[PDB]
Amino acid sequence: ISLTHQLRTGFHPGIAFTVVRQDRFATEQLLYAERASESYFVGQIQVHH
Amino acid sequence: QASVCEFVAMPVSTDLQYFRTACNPRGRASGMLYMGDRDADIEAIMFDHTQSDVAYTDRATLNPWASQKHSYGDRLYNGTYNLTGASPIYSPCFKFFT
Amino acid sequence: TLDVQMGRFMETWADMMPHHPHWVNEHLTILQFIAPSNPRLRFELNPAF
Amino acid sequence: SRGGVPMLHDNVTESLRRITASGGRLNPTEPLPIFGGLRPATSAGIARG
């Protein structure tokens, strides 16, 4: 309660705070890959009606 | 040609970024929300209240005394009854509050 | 006549309400103009009307 | 957050919640629903980020 009173009034109680805030940024990437990076296997198509 | 004013005003006070960084004349970097969630909310996104600031939520609107419906310094302005009828005006603004 | 003025003007100011609410604030600094704990604005928007 | 040891006088806790939701944006909605996620008063149009 006394913190409410002081922090409102303009008083500076004998503590200090460190803030932390998380942010996002949109970035375009850059990828490189060698020749035989993935051995890739393909099946046979099948249809459900 | 009387190259002249059309008063708005922006009472008063804070620190150093909203007349020291961004800003404009009747209040907030904003946006009434166009096409999105829906278009029969412009009485608490354009008239009543629920949350914090469409731009500057560091403190609540621009100047301590005009931020709703049918009021004065802009009572200079609105336009059904006669002041698009007797002295014709684009008026300081005729699409800033309309 | 002036004294039991005392007696019938405060003892109907007898039993106290449950929050005295919207006009008699007085002590903080500034941008509590700006995030209401506290009232002073819906009897506050421009004085002249 | 709900679960901590509450303060003895519920009136003090209510006034603290009022003064804490004060001065700030994100606040438990006023009815304080029991059996709820306590979502902030749902936002209108959105922000700048």
Swiss-Prot record, chain B:
Signal peptide: none annotated. It is found in: Virion; Host nucleus. It comes from the Viruses. Homomultimer. Makes the hexons and eleven out of twelve pentons. Interacts with triplex proteins 1/TRX1 and 2/TRX2; adjacent capsomers are linked together in groups of three by triplexes, heterotrimeric complexes composed of one molecule of TRX1 and two molecules of TRX2. Interacts with scaffold protein; this interaction allows efficient MCP transport to the host nucleus. Interacts with capsid vertex component 2/CVC2. Interacts with the small capsomere-interacting protein/SCP. Self-assembles to form an icosahedral capsid with a T=16 symmetry, about 200 nm in diameter, and consisting of 150 hexons and 12 pentons (total of 162 capsomers). Hexons form the edges and faces of the capsid and are each composed of six MCP molecules. In contrast, one penton is found at each of the 12 vertices. Eleven of the pentons are MCP pentamers, while the last vertex is occupied by the portal complex. Belongs to the herpesviridae major capsid protein family. This is Major capsid protein. It comes from Varicella-zoster virus (strain Dumas). The gene is MCP.
Swiss-Prot record, chain D:
It is found in: Virion; Host nucleus. Coiled coil: none annotated. Homomultimer. Makes the hexons and eleven out of twelve pentons. Interacts with triplex proteins 1/TRX1 and 2/TRX2; adjacent capsomers are linked together in groups of three by triplexes, heterotrimeric complexes composed of one molecule of TRX1 and two molecules of TRX2. Interacts with scaffold protein; this interaction allows efficient MCP transport to the host nucleus. Interacts with capsid vertex component 2/CVC2. Interacts with the small capsomere-interacting protein/SCP. Self-assembles to form an icosahedral capsid with a T=16 symmetry, about 200 nm in diameter, and consisting of 150 hexons and 12 pentons (total of 162 capsomers). Hexons form the edges and faces of the capsid and are each composed of six MCP molecules. In contrast, one penton is found at each of the 12 vertices. Eleven of the pentons are MCP pentamers, while the last vertex is occupied by the portal complex. This is Major capsid protein. It comes from the Viruses. Belongs to the herpesviridae major capsid protein family.
